[PDB]
């Protein structure tokens, strides 16, 4: 229908600087710097007052104005990842076999090694996406936490960990074994 | 501990030798001989033979204490005053015989104490709804007709 003008507001907190060349966004915060290529989207960024960015689509279609809000959400994710960070907590669910999950080094590659899933003798290996920190949480039984600035990398690595531990040839409703994201939140509490 | 007190409200056909195969499953675990409960139920609901009435059973010190719950619907049925029905064979007993306003109003008086209805008119409206469920007619009028009339004031229910 080609809306004349659609606009979204991106709020920039105090401790972050956003430098936006054409569609390459560089967001700097206390926890680090993230960069994103958004040249595939055809939007216009404009600073208002150094605490507000407006991202606009002019004469865009329905899909175009949908992708405008997608871009706004992605930049918001970048800003919250450099301010608060992202943490995905996964619990291990197992009926009989405890799932042996640890961190191993192979040529300096930081792989999450999984053994004994359904009793399998296969060794499942999940590479750690760069920037993602892994910590095994004490005071919670069988919980691994993946943290980082970028929600894309954190959630993607959690998703690979979840997908590599899918059950085959079994009623997945009964054989509920796996590694499942039990929480998705931010590293700094209640900000 | 025998001092344990436990309330056992159960709606049951009155005044008859009730289903042991229904009452024992509950009292049994509590250490309670079925027979004694059966005498208590039958005697307490004697008046309500052929009238399914709720009866509470207090339990303490491995004994029973029957008290026939004055359930609005069963009180309505007793107001209809049907001599003991052959429920065994007289299935589908359409107990909708007429009742003068007297008994319904008195039942509403009986039930007001627990009921939240701010007026005896309202409590009568409640009991008339129970009679609607029964099918019971009130003085050749649908109990909804009586309820609407009471709301209008024409059937002035005395407040006490």
């Amino acid at each position: 229908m080609k809306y004349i003008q659609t606009e979204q507001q991106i709020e920039v907190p105090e401790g972050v600087t956003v430098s936006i060349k054409s569609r390459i966004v560089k967001v700097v915060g206390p926890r680090g710097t993230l960069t994103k290529n958004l040249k595939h989207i055809d939007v216009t960024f404009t600073k208002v007052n150094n605490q507000l960015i407006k991202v606009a689509v002019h004469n865009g279609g329905r899909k175009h104005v949908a992708a405008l809000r997608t871009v706004k959400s992605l930049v918001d994710n970048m800003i919250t990842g450099v301010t608060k960070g992202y943490k995905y907590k996964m619990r291990y669910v197992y009926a009989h076999f405890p799932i042996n999950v640890n961190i191993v080094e192979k040529d300096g590659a930081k792989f999450i090694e999984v053994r004994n899933f359904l009793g399998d003798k296969k060794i499942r290996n999940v590479p750690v996406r760069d920037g993602v920190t892994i910590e095994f949480s004490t005071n919670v039984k069988d919980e691994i936490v993946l943290s980082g600035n970028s929600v894309e990398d954190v959630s993607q690595n959690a998703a690979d960990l979840q997908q590599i531990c899918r059950v085959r040839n079994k009623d997945i409703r009964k054989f509920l074994d796996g590694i499942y994201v039990s929480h998705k939140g931010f590293i700094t509490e209640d900000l | 501990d025998p001092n344990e007190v436990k309330y056992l409200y159960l709606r049951a056909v009155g005044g008859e030798v009730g289903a042991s195969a229904a009452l024992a499953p509950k009292i049994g675990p509590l250490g309670l001989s079925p027979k004694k409960v059966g005498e208590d139920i039958a005697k307490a609901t004697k008046e309500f033979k052929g009238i399914k009435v709720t009866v509470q059973l207090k339990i303490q010190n491995r004994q029973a204490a029957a008290s026939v719950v004055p359930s609005a619907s069963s009180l309505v049925i007793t107001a209809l005053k049907e001599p003991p029905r052959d429920r065994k064979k007289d299935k589908n007993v359409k107990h909708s015989g007429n009742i003068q306003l007297d008994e319904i109003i008195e039942i509403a008086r009986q039930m007001r104490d627990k009921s939240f209805g701010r007026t005896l008119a309202s409590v009568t409206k409640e009991i008339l709804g129970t009679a609607q469920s029964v099918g019971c007619r009130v003085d050749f009028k649908n109990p909804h007709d009586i309820i609407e009339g009471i709301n209008a004031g024409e059937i002035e229910i005395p407040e006490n």
Partner: protein, 200 residues
């Protein structure tokens, strides 16, 4: 039918305004229908409890302020789940009748805990395996033959601090009931000048 219904509500609200001289703004949050049922039963004849959608109430109140301008102070107080307990009777006894119902739930998950949790040293009796809550929250205790026994008094949460899921469920199985639920009058309109309920 919203026009006629809201107009009727406005009219009845006015009538309550004129006849009833004073009012009880009440925080009816987490009050069961049954709970309000006994509370209103107690308040029968004594006072009355009217309920409206805050925005509807506020629109009516502006409209009624048009002639009775003593209610701009009432305007902010119509916020959240709050009931107007209209009253032509002594506010002290009205406040008592409101306060009475405090049906306590054990650590209702999520809701803002209104009490300073002191988990007294008590034989829990609850099953061993469920220690998870205790262990996660520290809460020094002793697992004696399955039946854990709280060794010392622990303030897992307090008043005004939303119960975290863990401690909420912990006191849920521990059967300590801090979440006394009952309509809590926030403010009380007094014949031209609202005052905070606290005094009554």
């Amino acid at each position: 039918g919203i026009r006629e219904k809201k107009a009727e509500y406005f009219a009845k609200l006015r009538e309550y305004l004129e006849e009833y001289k004073s009012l009880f703004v009440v925080g009816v949050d987490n009050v069961s229908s049954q709970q309000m049922h006994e509370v209103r039963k107690e308040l029968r004849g004594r006072a009355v409890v009217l309920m409206g959608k805050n925005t509807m109430v506020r629109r009516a109140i502006r409209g009624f302020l048009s002639d009775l301008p003593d209610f701009e102070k009432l305007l902010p107080f119509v916020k959240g789940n709050v009931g107007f307990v209209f009253t032509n009777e002594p506010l002290t006894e009205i406040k008592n009748v409101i306060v009475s119902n405090r049906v306590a739930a054990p650590a209702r998950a999520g809701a803002v805990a209104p009490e300073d949790i002191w988990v007294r040293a008590v034989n829990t009796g609850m099953e061993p395996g469920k220690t998870s809550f205790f262990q996660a929250l520290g809460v020094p205790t002793k697992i004696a033959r399955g039946t854990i026994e709280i060794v010392s008094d622990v303030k897992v949460v307090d008043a005004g601090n939303k119960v975290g899921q863990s401690e909420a469920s912990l006191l849920n199985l521990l059967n300590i009931s801090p979440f006394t639920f009952g309509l809590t009058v926030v403010q009380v309109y007094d014949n031209g000048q609202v005052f905070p309920s606290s005094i009554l």
